[PDB]
Design a protein around this ligand. Structure first.
Ligand SMILES: [Cl-]
Ligand SMILES: [Cl-]
Ligand SMILES: [Cl-]
Lengths: 137, 136
């Protein structure tokens, strides 16, 4: 009810509700850095992917169009991490990377196929649609 | 004791220490967005400016070279604000904008003078300045 009217407010602002989080699928493309700053300006972050269930929601909604998510590599030689400061599960990510990815500039992940294995490692300065997440509180 | 080794640890990473804060003057240019994400990765933000003495420290060190700072407005129409969420003192700012000033809007320091802030497109590539408070 109060959750229901909060959902209605966010839906009118372009957000989708799923499993206790709000998601913003953008209408225009941005670099990974600019998209993260846009999500911050919306009290959000580029989305993390914490479960197979969340990955399935994201890839279906992304509809085979590249969408930035919030995983980035600390330069070409670092580990991958989530900008929202949840801990990255690199072992499960073997179920999410497109085979052969990360291909290994600056390195940023985007969802680009309508399958479970959908993450691509792409140059962070490419301009793609993007996906913010903000937990419902 | 630990205070001097704390300061020396950041200085050895390439930060300047000035009056209670660490500053990172970058070696490579970036867009404003990429510079802010770099500062975040170092537990920092693009610098705010909250006094005359801080403004003077920054413009002297910037040496007339454009440097991003942490002031922005969302679209040509929002109010200006500091990304580190400190309060923006509009009245004080009038002593820091270049005379005449102020799609994407981001401030950079670009003159070796007190009046040195420029309103520039966020997708320009400039050197930048991070700030991290010293907490003991
Ligand atoms: Cl958008
Ligand atoms: Cl950018
Ligand atoms: Cl640098």
């Amino acid at each position: 009810s109060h959750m229901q009217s909060d959902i209605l407010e966010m839906v009118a602002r372009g957000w989708k509700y799923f499993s206790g989080n709000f998601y913003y699928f953008s209408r225009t493309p941005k670099t990974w850095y600019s998209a993260e700053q846009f999500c911050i300006s919306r009290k959000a972050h580029l989305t993390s992917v914490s479960s197979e269930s969340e990955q399935k929601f994201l890839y279906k909604a992304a509809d085979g169009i590249p969408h930035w998510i919030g995983l980035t590599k600390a330069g070409s030689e670092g580990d991958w991490y989530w900008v929202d400061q949840t801990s990255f599960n690199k072992e499960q990510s073997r179920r999410f990377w497109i085979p052969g990815e990360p291909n290994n500039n600056e390195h940023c992940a985007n969802i680009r196929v309508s399958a479970l294995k959908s993450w691509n490692d792409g140059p962070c300065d490419n301009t793609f649609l993007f996906i913010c997440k903000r937990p419902y509180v």
